[PDB]
Coordinates of C-alpha atoms and ligand atoms in Angstrom, one line a residue:
Chain O
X1 CA 134.1 -9.6 91.7
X2 CA 135.3 -11.4 94.8
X3 CA 138.6 -10.6 96.6
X4 CA 140.6 -13.7 97.6
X5 CA 144.2 -12.6 98.4
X6 CA 146.0 -9.7 100.1
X7 CA 149.7 -9.1 100.0
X8 CA 150.9 -10.8 103.2
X9 CA 153.2 -8.8 105.4
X10 CA 155.8 -9.7 108.1
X11 CA 157.6 -7.2 110.3
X12 CA 161.0 -7.3 112.1
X13 CA 159.3 -6.1 115.3
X14 CA 162.7 -5.8 117.0
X15 CA 163.9 -3.5 114.3
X16 CA 160.6 -1.6 114.2
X17 CA 160.5 -0.9 117.9
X18 CA 164.1 -0.8 119.2
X19 CA 165.7 0.6 116.0
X20 CA 168.8 -1.6 116.0
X21 CA 170.0 -0.1 119.3
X22 CA 171.8 -2.4 121.7
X23 CA 170.5 -1.0 125.0
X24 CA 167.0 -0.5 123.5
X25 CA 167.0 -4.2 122.3
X26 CA 168.1 -5.3 125.8
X27 CA 165.4 -3.3 127.5
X28 CA 162.5 -4.6 125.4
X29 CA 163.4 -8.2 126.4
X30 CA 162.0 -7.3 129.9
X31 CA 158.5 -6.9 128.3
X32 CA 158.1 -10.7 127.8
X33 CA 157.2 -12.3 124.5
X34 CA 155.0 -9.8 122.5
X35 CA 158.0 -9.9 120.0
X36 CA 157.5 -13.5 119.0
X37 CA 153.7 -13.6 119.4
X38 CA 153.1 -10.8 116.9
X39 CA 155.6 -12.4 114.5
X40 CA 153.9 -15.8 114.7
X41 CA 150.4 -14.2 114.2
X42 CA 151.6 -12.5 111.0
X43 CA 153.2 -15.7 109.7
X44 CA 149.9 -17.5 110.4
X45 CA 148.2 -14.8 108.4
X46 CA 150.5 -15.4 105.5
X47 CA 150.3 -19.2 105.4
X48 CA 146.5 -19.0 105.8
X49 CA 146.2 -16.6 102.9
Chain Z
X1 CA 173.4 65.3 104.9
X2 CA 169.7 64.6 104.1
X3 CA 167.1 65.8 101.6
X4 CA 163.7 66.7 102.9
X5 CA 161.0 65.9 100.3
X6 CA 157.5 65.4 101.6
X7 CA 153.9 65.7 100.4
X8 CA 151.5 67.6 102.7
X9 CA 148.4 65.7 101.5
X10 CA 148.1 62.1 102.7
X11 CA 146.4 59.7 100.3
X12 CA 144.2 56.8 101.3
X13 CA 145.6 53.3 100.7
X14 CA 144.3 51.5 97.6
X15 CA 143.3 47.8 97.7
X16 CA 143.7 45.0 95.2
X17 CA 143.0 41.3 95.8
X18 CA 145.7 38.7 95.3
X19 CA 144.7 35.6 93.3
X20 CA 147.3 32.8 93.8
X21 CA 150.7 34.4 94.1
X22 CA 153.0 34.2 97.1
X23 CA 154.1 30.6 97.6
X24 CA 157.7 29.4 98.4
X25 CA 159.3 26.0 98.8
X26 CA 158.7 25.2 102.5
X27 CA 162.0 23.4 102.8
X28 CA 165.2 22.9 100.7
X29 CA 164.3 19.2 100.3
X30 CA 163.0 17.3 97.2
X31 CA 160.2 14.8 96.6
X32 CA 159.7 12.8 93.5
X33 CA 156.4 13.9 91.9
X34 CA 154.3 13.1 94.9
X35 CA 151.5 15.1 96.5
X36 CA 152.6 16.3 100.0
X37 CA 151.1 18.5 102.7
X38 CA 152.8 20.9 105.1
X39 CA 151.9 23.6 107.7
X40 CA 154.1 26.7 107.4
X41 CA 153.7 30.5 107.2
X42 CA 152.3 31.3 103.7
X43 CA 150.2 33.7 101.7
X44 CA 146.5 32.9 101.3
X45 CA 145.3 32.8 97.7
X46 CA 142.5 35.3 98.1
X47 CA 144.1 38.0 100.3
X48 CA 143.2 41.7 100.0
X49 CA 146.8 43.0 99.7
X50 CA 147.7 46.7 99.5
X51 CA 148.6 48.7 96.3
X52 CA 151.1 51.6 96.2
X53 CA 151.8 53.7 93.2
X54 CA 154.4 56.4 92.9
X55 CA 153.4 59.0 90.3
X56 CA 155.8 61.5 88.5
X57 CA 155.1 64.0 85.8
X58 CA 150.3 65.2 88.7
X59 CA 152.8 63.4 91.0
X60 CA 152.8 61.2 94.1
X61 CA 155.7 61.0 96.5
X62 CA 155.1 59.0 99.7
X63 CA 156.9 56.0 101.2
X64 CA 155.1 55.1 104.4
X65 CA 156.3 52.7 107.1
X66 CA 154.6 49.3 107.0
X67 CA 154.8 46.5 109.6
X68 CA 156.5 43.2 109.0
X69 CA 154.1 40.8 110.8
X70 CA 156.3 37.7 110.9
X71 CA 157.0 38.0 107.2
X72 CA 156.4 40.1 104.1
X73 CA 155.4 39.4 100.5
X74 CA 156.8 42.0 98.0
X75 CA 156.6 42.3 94.3
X76 CA 156.9 45.1 91.6
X77 CA 157.3 45.7 87.9
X78 CA 160.0 48.5 87.6
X79 CA 161.5 49.6 84.3
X80 CA 164.1 52.2 85.4
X81 CA 165.7 50.2 88.2
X82 CA 164.4 52.7 90.7
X83 CA 163.8 50.2 93.5
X84 CA 167.2 49.2 94.9
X85 CA 166.7 47.4 98.3
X86 CA 164.9 47.2 101.6
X87 CA 165.6 48.5 105.2
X88 CA 164.6 46.6 108.3
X89 CA 164.7 47.2 112.0
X90 CA 162.8 47.9 115.2
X91 CA 163.5 51.6 115.9
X92 CA 165.1 52.5 112.6
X93 CA 167.6 54.9 114.3
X94 CA 170.8 54.9 116.2
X95 CA 169.1 53.8 119.4
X96 CA 169.0 50.1 118.3
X97 CA 170.3 47.9 115.5
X98 CA 168.7 47.8 112.0
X99 CA 169.2 45.7 108.9
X100 CA 170.1 47.3 105.6
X101 CA 169.7 45.7 102.1
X102 CA 170.5 47.5 98.9
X103 CA 171.7 46.8 95.3
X104 CA 174.1 48.6 93.0
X105 CA 175.1 48.1 89.3
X106 CA 178.0 45.9 90.4
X107 CA 176.9 43.7 93.3
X108 CA 174.4 43.2 96.2
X109 CA 175.1 45.0 99.5
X110 CA 173.6 43.8 102.8
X111 CA 174.7 45.5 106.0
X112 CA 173.9 45.0 109.7
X113 CA 174.8 48.1 111.8
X114 CA 173.1 50.7 114.0
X115 CA 172.1 52.7 111.0
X116 CA 170.3 56.1 111.4
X117 CA 167.4 56.2 109.0
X118 CA 166.0 59.5 107.6
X119 CA 162.3 60.5 107.6
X120 CA 162.3 60.2 103.8
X121 CA 165.4 58.2 102.9
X122 CA 166.5 57.4 99.4
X123 CA 169.6 56.6 97.4
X124 CA 171.1 59.5 95.4
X125 CA 172.6 58.9 91.9
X126 CA 174.1 61.4 89.5
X127 CA 175.9 61.4 86.1
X128 CA 179.4 62.5 85.4
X129 CA 180.1 63.9 81.9
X130 CA 183.9 63.1 82.2
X131 CA 183.3 59.6 83.4
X132 CA 180.3 59.0 81.1
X133 CA 178.7 56.8 83.7
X134 CA 176.2 56.9 86.6
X135 CA 177.6 56.4 90.1
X136 CA 175.9 56.2 93.5
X137 CA 178.6 57.6 95.8
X138 CA 176.3 59.6 98.1
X139 CA 174.5 57.3 100.7
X140 CA 171.6 59.6 101.2
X141 CA 169.6 56.8 102.8
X142 CA 171.3 57.2 106.2
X143 CA 173.4 59.8 108.0
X144 CA 175.9 57.5 109.8
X145 CA 176.7 53.9 110.6
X146 CA 177.9 52.5 113.9
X147 CA 178.3 49.2 115.7
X148 CA 178.9 47.2 112.5
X149 CA 178.2 43.6 113.7
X150 CA 177.5 41.8 110.4
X151 CA 178.0 42.3 106.7
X152 CA 177.0 40.1 103.7
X153 CA 177.5 40.3 99.9
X154 CA 176.6 38.2 96.9
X155 CA 176.4 38.5 93.2
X156 CA 173.5 40.3 91.5
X157 CA 170.4 38.2 91.4
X158 CA 168.5 38.9 88.2
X159 CA 169.4 42.1 86.3
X160 CA 172.0 44.7 85.5
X161 CA 171.3 48.2 86.8
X162 CA 171.6 51.0 84.2
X163 CA 169.7 54.1 83.0
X164 CA 166.9 52.8 80.8
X165 CA 163.6 53.9 79.2
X166 CA 162.0 50.5 79.0
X167 CA 158.7 48.8 78.8
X168 CA 156.8 46.5 81.3
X169 CA 157.6 42.9 80.3
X170 CA 158.6 41.1 83.5
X171 CA 157.5 40.8 87.1
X172 CA 159.8 40.3 90.2
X173 CA 158.2 38.8 93.3
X174 CA 159.9 38.3 96.6
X175 CA 159.1 36.7 100.0
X176 CA 160.8 37.8 103.2
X177 CA 161.0 35.8 106.4
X178 CA 162.9 35.7 109.7
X179 CA 162.8 32.7 112.1
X180 CA 165.0 31.4 114.8
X181 CA 167.6 34.1 114.3
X182 CA 167.8 33.4 110.6
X183 CA 166.7 35.6 107.7
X184 CA 165.7 34.0 104.4
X185 CA 165.1 35.5 100.9
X186 CA 162.8 34.0 98.3
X187 CA 162.6 35.3 94.7
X188 CA 161.3 34.3 91.2
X189 CA 161.6 36.1 87.9
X190 CA 158.7 35.8 85.5
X191 CA 158.3 37.7 82.2
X192 CA 154.7 38.8 81.8
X193 CA 153.6 41.6 79.5
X194 CA 149.8 41.4 80.2
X195 CA 147.9 44.4 81.4
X196 CA 146.8 42.5 84.4
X197 CA 148.6 43.1 87.7
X198 CA 149.1 39.5 88.7
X199 CA 149.5 36.3 86.6
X200 CA 147.5 33.0 86.8
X201 CA 149.7 31.7 89.6
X202 CA 151.6 28.9 87.9
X203 CA 155.1 29.8 89.2
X204 CA 156.6 29.3 92.6
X205 CA 159.6 31.0 94.2
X206 CA 163.0 29.6 95.1
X207 CA 165.4 30.1 98.0
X208 CA 168.1 32.6 97.3
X209 CA 170.3 33.1 100.4
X210 CA 169.9 32.4 104.1
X211 CA 171.2 35.1 106.5
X212 CA 171.6 34.0 110.2
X213 CA 171.3 37.2 112.2
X214 CA 169.9 37.4 115.7
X215 CA 167.8 40.6 115.5
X216 CA 164.1 41.4 115.9
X217 CA 162.3 43.0 113.0
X218 CA 158.8 44.5 113.5
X219 CA 158.5 46.8 110.5
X220 CA 160.1 47.4 107.2
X221 CA 160.5 50.1 104.5
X222 CA 161.1 50.2 100.8
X223 CA 164.1 51.8 99.1
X224 CA 163.9 54.0 96.0
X225 CA 166.6 55.6 93.8
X226 CA 166.4 59.3 93.0
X227 CA 168.2 60.7 90.0
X228 CA 169.9 64.1 90.0
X229 CA 168.2 66.4 87.4
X230 CA 170.3 67.9 84.6
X231 CA 168.0 70.6 83.4
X232 CA 167.6 71.2 79.7
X233 CA 166.5 74.6 78.4
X234 CA 162.9 73.4 78.6
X235 CA 162.7 71.3 81.8
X236 CA 161.8 71.9 85.5
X237 CA 162.7 70.0 88.6
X238 CA 162.7 70.2 92.4
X239 CA 166.4 69.0 92.6
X240 CA 165.6 65.3 92.4
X241 CA 163.8 63.3 89.7
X242 CA 162.6 59.7 89.6
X243 CA 160.3 57.6 87.4
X244 CA 156.9 56.2 88.1
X245 CA 157.0 53.2 90.4
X246 CA 154.6 50.8 92.0
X247 CA 154.7 47.6 94.1
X248 CA 152.6 45.3 96.3
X249 CA 152.7 44.2 100.0
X250 CA 151.6 40.9 101.4
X251 CA 151.3 39.5 104.9
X252 CA 151.9 35.9 106.0
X253 CA 149.6 33.9 108.2
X254 CA 149.7 30.5 109.9
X255 CA 148.1 28.1 107.5
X256 CA 148.7 24.6 106.0
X257 CA 149.0 23.8 102.3
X258 CA 148.9 20.9 99.9
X259 CA 151.7 20.9 97.3
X260 CA 152.2 19.1 94.0
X261 CA 155.8 18.2 93.1
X262 CA 156.9 17.0 89.6
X263 CA 159.5 14.5 88.5
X264 CA 161.9 17.3 87.6
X265 CA 161.7 19.1 91.0
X266 CA 159.4 22.0 90.3
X267 CA 156.1 22.8 92.2
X268 CA 153.6 23.0 89.4
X269 CA 150.6 23.8 91.6
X270 CA 149.2 23.8 95.2
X271 CA 146.1 24.5 97.2
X272 CA 145.2 26.0 100.6
Chain A
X1 CA 184.4 9.2 100.4
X2 CA 183.0 5.7 100.2
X3 CA 180.8 4.4 97.4
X4 CA 178.9 1.2 96.6
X5 CA 179.4 -0.2 100.2
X6 CA 177.3 -0.7 103.3
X7 CA 178.3 2.3 105.4
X8 CA 176.8 5.0 107.6
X9 CA 176.3 8.5 106.2
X10 CA 176.0 11.9 107.9
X11 CA 176.4 14.6 105.1
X12 CA 175.0 18.0 106.3
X13 CA 173.9 16.7 109.7
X14 CA 171.3 14.0 109.1
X15 CA 171.9 10.4 109.9
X16 CA 171.5 7.0 108.2
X17 CA 173.2 3.7 107.3
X18 CA 173.1 2.1 103.9
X19 CA 174.8 1.8 100.4
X20 CA 175.6 4.8 98.2
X21 CA 175.3 4.7 94.4
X22 CA 175.2 6.9 91.4
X23 CA 171.8 8.6 90.8
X24 CA 169.9 9.6 87.7
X25 CA 167.9 12.2 89.5
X26 CA 168.5 15.9 88.7
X27 CA 168.0 18.4 91.5
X28 CA 167.6 22.2 91.5
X29 CA 170.4 24.3 93.0
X30 CA 168.6 24.9 96.3
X31 CA 167.9 21.2 96.8
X32 CA 170.1 19.4 99.4
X33 CA 168.9 15.8 99.7
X34 CA 166.0 13.7 98.3
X35 CA 163.1 12.7 100.5
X36 CA 160.7 9.9 99.6
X37 CA 157.0 9.4 100.6
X38 CA 156.3 8.5 104.2
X39 CA 159.2 10.8 105.2
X40 CA 162.2 8.6 104.4
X41 CA 165.4 9.9 102.9
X42 CA 166.5 8.2 99.6
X43 CA 168.9 10.7 97.9
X44 CA 171.5 13.1 99.1
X45 CA 173.9 15.5 97.3
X46 CA 177.6 15.3 97.9
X47 CA 178.6 18.7 99.4
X48 CA 182.2 18.5 98.2
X49 CA 181.9 17.4 94.6
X50 CA 178.3 18.8 94.2
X51 CA 177.0 15.4 93.0
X52 CA 173.7 13.7 93.9
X53 CA 173.7 10.1 95.0
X54 CA 171.0 7.5 95.9
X55 CA 170.5 5.8 99.2
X56 CA 169.6 2.1 99.6
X57 CA 169.1 0.9 103.2
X58 CA 170.9 -2.2 104.5
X59 CA 169.7 -5.5 102.9
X60 CA 167.7 -6.8 105.8
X61 CA 165.8 -10.0 105.7
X62 CA 164.6 -12.9 107.9
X63 CA 166.4 -16.3 107.7
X64 CA 164.4 -19.4 107.0
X65 CA 165.2 -23.1 106.6
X66 CA 163.6 -26.2 105.1
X67 CA 163.5 -29.6 106.7
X68 CA 161.9 -32.9 105.6
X69 CA 161.5 -34.1 109.2
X70 CA 163.7 -34.7 112.3
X71 CA 163.0 -38.5 112.3
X72 CA 163.3 -38.7 108.5
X73 CA 166.9 -37.4 108.3
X74 CA 169.3 -34.9 109.8
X75 CA 170.1 -33.1 106.6
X76 CA 168.8 -29.5 106.2
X77 CA 168.8 -26.6 103.7
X78 CA 168.5 -22.9 104.3
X79 CA 166.6 -20.2 102.4
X80 CA 167.5 -16.5 102.7
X81 CA 164.4 -14.4 102.3
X82 CA 164.6 -11.6 99.6
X83 CA 168.3 -11.1 99.5
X84 CA 170.6 -11.1 96.5
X85 CA 173.1 -13.9 96.4
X86 CA 176.0 -11.5 95.9
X87 CA 176.4 -10.4 99.5
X88 CA 175.1 -13.4 101.4
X89 CA 178.4 -14.6 102.9
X90 CA 178.6 -11.6 105.2
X91 CA 176.5 -13.7 107.6
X92 CA 179.6 -14.9 109.6
Chain Q
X1 CA 145.5 -6.2 85.0
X2 CA 146.3 -3.0 83.1
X3 CA 143.5 -1.2 84.9
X4 CA 144.5 -2.3 88.4
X5 CA 147.4 -0.4 89.9
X6 CA 148.0 1.8 93.0
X7 CA 155.5 -0.5 97.9
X8 CA 159.0 -1.7 98.8
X9 CA 161.1 -2.6 101.8
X10 CA 161.8 0.3 104.1
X11 CA 163.3 0.0 107.6
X12 CA 162.5 -3.5 108.7
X13 CA 159.2 -3.8 106.9
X14 CA 159.1 -6.9 104.6
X15 CA 156.9 -8.3 101.8
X16 CA 156.8 -11.9 100.9
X17 CA 156.2 -13.4 97.4
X18 CA 152.9 -15.1 96.7
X19 CA 152.7 -18.9 96.7
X20 CA 151.4 -19.0 93.1
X21 CA 152.6 -16.6 90.4
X22 CA 150.4 -14.9 87.8
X23 CA 151.4 -17.3 85.1
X24 CA 150.5 -20.3 87.3
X25 CA 147.1 -18.8 88.3
Chain D
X1 CA 171.8 -22.4 119.0
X2 CA 175.0 -21.9 117.1
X3 CA 175.8 -25.3 115.6
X4 CA 173.3 -25.9 112.7
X5 CA 170.2 -24.0 111.5
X6 CA 168.3 -27.1 112.5
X7 CA 169.4 -26.5 116.1
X8 CA 168.4 -22.9 115.9
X9 CA 164.9 -24.0 114.8
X10 CA 164.7 -26.5 117.6
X11 CA 165.4 -23.6 119.9
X12 CA 162.8 -21.4 118.1
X13 CA 160.2 -24.0 118.9
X14 CA 160.2 -26.2 122.0
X15 CA 160.9 -29.8 120.8
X16 CA 163.7 -32.0 119.6
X17 CA 161.6 -33.6 116.9
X18 CA 160.7 -30.7 114.6
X19 CA 158.3 -31.5 111.8
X20 CA 158.5 -30.9 108.1
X21 CA 157.5 -27.5 106.8
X22 CA 158.8 -23.9 106.7
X23 CA 160.1 -21.9 109.7
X24 CA 161.2 -18.4 110.2
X25 CA 163.8 -19.0 113.0
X26 CA 165.5 -15.5 113.2
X27 CA 166.5 -12.6 111.0
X28 CA 169.6 -11.4 109.1
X29 CA 171.0 -7.8 109.1
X30 CA 174.2 -6.8 107.3
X31 CA 176.5 -4.6 109.3
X32 CA 178.3 -1.5 107.9
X33 CA 181.7 0.0 108.4
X34 CA 181.6 3.2 110.5
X35 CA 182.5 6.4 108.6
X36 CA 181.5 10.0 109.1
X37 CA 181.5 10.9 105.4
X38 CA 181.7 14.2 103.5
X39 CA 181.5 17.1 105.9
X40 CA 180.2 20.1 103.9
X41 CA 182.5 22.4 101.9
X42 CA 184.7 25.2 103.4
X43 CA 184.3 28.7 102.0
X44 CA 187.2 30.6 103.6
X45 CA 189.3 30.2 106.8
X46 CA 189.5 32.7 109.6
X47 CA 191.6 35.8 108.6
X48 CA 194.3 35.1 111.2
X49 CA 197.0 36.0 108.7
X50 CA 196.8 39.8 108.9
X51 CA 196.4 39.6 112.7
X52 CA 199.4 37.5 113.5
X53 CA 201.5 38.4 110.5
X54 CA 200.7 42.1 110.5
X55 CA 203.9 44.1 109.9
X56 CA 203.0 46.8 112.4
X57 CA 200.7 46.7 115.4
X58 CA 199.0 49.5 117.3
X59 CA 199.6 51.1 120.7
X60 CA 197.9 49.8 123.8
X61 CA 195.8 53.0 124.3
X62 CA 194.7 52.7 120.6
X63 CA 194.2 48.9 120.7
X64 CA 192.5 47.8 117.5
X65 CA 189.1 46.0 117.5
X66 CA 188.8 43.0 115.3
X67 CA 185.6 41.0 114.4
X68 CA 185.7 37.4 113.1
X69 CA 182.6 35.8 111.7
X70 CA 181.3 33.7 108.8
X71 CA 184.6 31.9 108.6
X72 CA 186.4 28.8 109.8
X73 CA 188.9 29.3 112.7
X74 CA 191.9 26.9 112.8
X75 CA 193.5 27.4 116.2
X76 CA 195.8 24.4 115.5
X77 CA 197.8 26.7 113.4
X78 CA 198.2 28.9 116.5
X79 CA 198.9 26.6 119.4
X80 CA 201.0 24.0 117.5
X81 CA 203.5 26.6 116.4
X82 CA 206.3 27.0 118.9
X83 CA 206.8 30.7 118.1
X84 CA 204.8 32.3 120.9
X85 CA 206.3 33.1 124.3
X86 CA 203.1 32.6 126.3
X87 CA 199.8 30.8 125.7
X88 CA 197.1 31.2 128.3
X89 CA 193.4 30.3 127.9
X90 CA 190.8 30.9 130.7
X91 CA 187.7 28.9 131.0
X92 CA 188.1 27.2 127.7
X93 CA 190.3 24.4 126.2
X94 CA 192.3 25.6 123.2
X95 CA 192.8 22.1 121.9
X96 CA 189.0 21.5 121.8
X97 CA 188.4 24.9 120.0
Ligands
LIG301 C1 184.5 22.5 97.6 O1 184.0 22.6 96.3 C2 185.0 22.8 95.3 C3 184.3 22.9 93.9 O2 183.8 21.6 93.5 C4 186.0 21.6 95.3 O3 187.0 21.9 94.4 C5 187.1 20.9 93.3 O4 186.9 19.5 93.8 C6 186.9 18.5 92.8 C7 186.7 17.2 93.4 O5 187.8 16.3 93.2 C8 188.2 18.6 92.0 O6 188.1 17.7 90.9 C9 188.4 20.0 91.4 O7 189.7 20.1 90.8 C10 188.4 21.0 92.5 N1 188.5 22.4 92.0 C11 189.1 23.4 92.7 C12 189.2 24.7 92.0 O8 189.7 23.2 93.8 C13 186.6 21.5 96.7 O9 187.4 20.3 96.8 C14 185.5 21.4 97.8 N2 186.0 21.3 99.1 C15 186.8 22.3 99.7 C16 187.3 22.0 101.0 O10 187.1 23.3 99.1
NAG302 C1 138.6 43.1 99.3 O1 138.5 44.2 98.4 C2 137.3 44.2 97.6 C3 137.4 45.3 96.6 O2 136.8 46.5 97.1 C4 136.1 44.2 98.4 O3 134.9 44.1 97.6 C5 136.1 43.1 99.5 O4 135.0 43.2 100.4 C6 137.4 43.1 100.3 N1 137.5 42.1 101.2 C7 137.5 40.8 100.9 C8 137.5 39.8 102.1 O5 137.4 40.4 99.7
NAG303 C1 161.8 18.2 82.8 O1 163.0 17.5 82.6 C2 163.2 17.0 81.2 C3 164.5 16.3 81.2 O2 164.6 15.4 80.1 C4 163.1 18.2 80.2 O3 163.2 17.7 78.9 C5 161.8 19.0 80.4 O4 161.8 20.1 79.6 C6 161.7 19.4 81.9 N1 160.4 20.1 82.0 C7 160.2 21.1 82.9 C8 158.8 21.7 83.0 O5 161.1 21.5 83.6
NAG304 C1 158.8 -40.7 111.0 O1 158.2 -39.6 110.4 C2 157.2 -39.9 109.4 C3 156.8 -38.6 108.8 O2 156.1 -38.9 107.5 C4 156.1 -40.7 110.0 O3 155.2 -41.2 109.0 C5 156.6 -42.0 110.7 O4 155.6 -42.6 111.4 C6 157.7 -41.5 111.7 N1 158.3 -42.7 112.4 C7 158.5 -42.8 113.7 C8 159.1 -44.0 114.2 O5 158.2 -41.8 114.5
NAG305 C1 172.3 -9.3 92.2 O1 173.6 -8.7 91.9 C2 174.1 -8.9 90.6 C3 175.5 -8.3 90.5 O2 175.6 -7.2 91.4 C4 173.1 -8.4 89.6 O3 173.6 -8.8 88.3 C5 171.7 -9.0 89.8 O4 170.8 -8.4 88.9 C6 171.3 -8.7 91.3 N1 170.0 -9.3 91.5 C7 169.0 -8.7 92.3 C8 167.7 -9.5 92.4 O5 169.2 -7.6 92.8
NAG306 C1 203.4 34.1 109.2 O1 204.4 34.2 108.2 C2 205.5 33.3 108.3 C3 206.5 33.6 107.2 O2 206.3 34.9 106.7 C4 205.0 31.9 108.3 O3 206.1 31.0 108.5 C5 203.9 31.7 109.3 O4 203.3 30.4 109.2 C6 202.8 32.7 109.2 N1 201.8 32.6 110.2 C7 200.8 31.8 110.1 C8 199.8 31.8 111.3 O5 200.6 31.1 109.1

């Protein structure tokens, strides 16, 4: 038996962290670009799988 | 007035070990047949609980005061409806406020006043030949009531109170708690006719009614009903007669449990 | 009351936004609302009509597009990721 | 396949379909 | 960023010559209509009736002592009616009661 595929996952990190709150969403923008970096890492995981 | 009925001899407590009983739904929420864990105030499976037995013809008459300890587990198998309620408080007198719970043949009576409890309180009942019925007019449990701050009432929970000479076929088990100024009642009716004192432990209790009252309870006391004796040509009595009775007392403790829910919404089993 | 629509719900004091619908689940008299694994609410009883209803959160999903190439052409097509076609035009 | 068995979308979390389906594989 | 999905992608990356493939430019979330729905049931209102519509009252030396609990109090029935000579509330807003 050899594993070859795992169910790829992507996360709406804005929703996960800020919780669809306007001021919370505004504040997180001050922490740079972790938002997009994590999303692109996950999509790379998916396409690679 | 009050009736003084005491036994000079004090008997040692008798011990019997619980097996699995004494579990209640931790919340009023539902989960769909999924194992789930929680950490609340429960009854350990193997707890050396206390055993009390009232004997009548030789006879045993003693109803001592027991502490509450953050919650109480109560159960009994009565056949003549002798047990009728519970009384709670801190000083159990007119100095402070105490909680009263009692049942009658018609309804359920719960009262919150500055009740003055007796040394050996009980509820007096008697029979009227003209009325052909039993009534409980005399409130021999307490002498007077004052500072009535709360009163509650709800329909009878499991049974109808009458004068019966029955057999042991069912067991009533109750769990009592008070948290954050709220008082909660848990119950479950299970018909068991086995000689054993406790069942395997399949069943689990359900919430009955939540009473928000901001009072401190440190100890509790049972309530028993005493029947006035109508003497036949060949009977003797001391002015009051009651049937044999027994019950059990359990104590909560801070623990955490693992619970099994089913698709229907019934807790089939659990583990400590 | 609002049913079969994307709304917010409060009920006995909890919070949440989603779509309410009829439920096949049968609850005991003490039960108030249904909770799913990982501590997420999925069912709630109606306190007025004493009826249980399901909870489905808002149909969230990322938006994606397809493109054969900028220099190839300017045409484009769009793919909505894991959303039913019934309620797509709410995009504005 | 009948032997192997243990989710859905909850609160922002997403799952994407596989590139090749079981019939194609 | 609001003209054509292609433009939104050109903003998501940093180029004007985006290449063929698949791109996750942004995300969609449906919006609800605000509604505080289905407050729980009402058992019984406050027994104001036998207090304000009592046929007799008591003397000032023997002022009666009334308790109100486990019920819903609707003061709007009180302060909306123009049948009371005076209406004074101290340290509390009757409208917000
Ligand atoms: C509280 O609950 C009662 C019992 O369900 C509600 O009364 C019923 O409401 C349904 C809903 O449409 C009606 O079809 C019935 O005709 C009602 N019956 C009676 C006897 O009123 C009641 O509406 C709920 N809310 C309040 C504020 O009482
Ligand atoms: C409980 O009671 C039984 C019966 O006498 C006794 O053997 C035991 O030591 C007691 N304590 C515990 C913890 O079981
Ligand atoms: C569970 O619910 C079903 C409903 O179809 C019923 O038939 C069954 O008897 C129930 N079982 C228990 C243990 O409640
Ligand atoms: C246009 O794009 C295609 C992509 O296949 C490429 O082969 C071609 O060289 C491009 N032409 C120019 C002029 O960039
Ligand atoms: C989409 O909605 C239609 C009508 O409501 C329904 O028939 C269909 O099964 C739905 N499809 C999915 C994937 O939910
Ligand atoms: C008192 O009774 C009168 C008529 O008898 C009625 O108009 C009035 O509304 C009642 N008061 C209240 C507070 O409802």
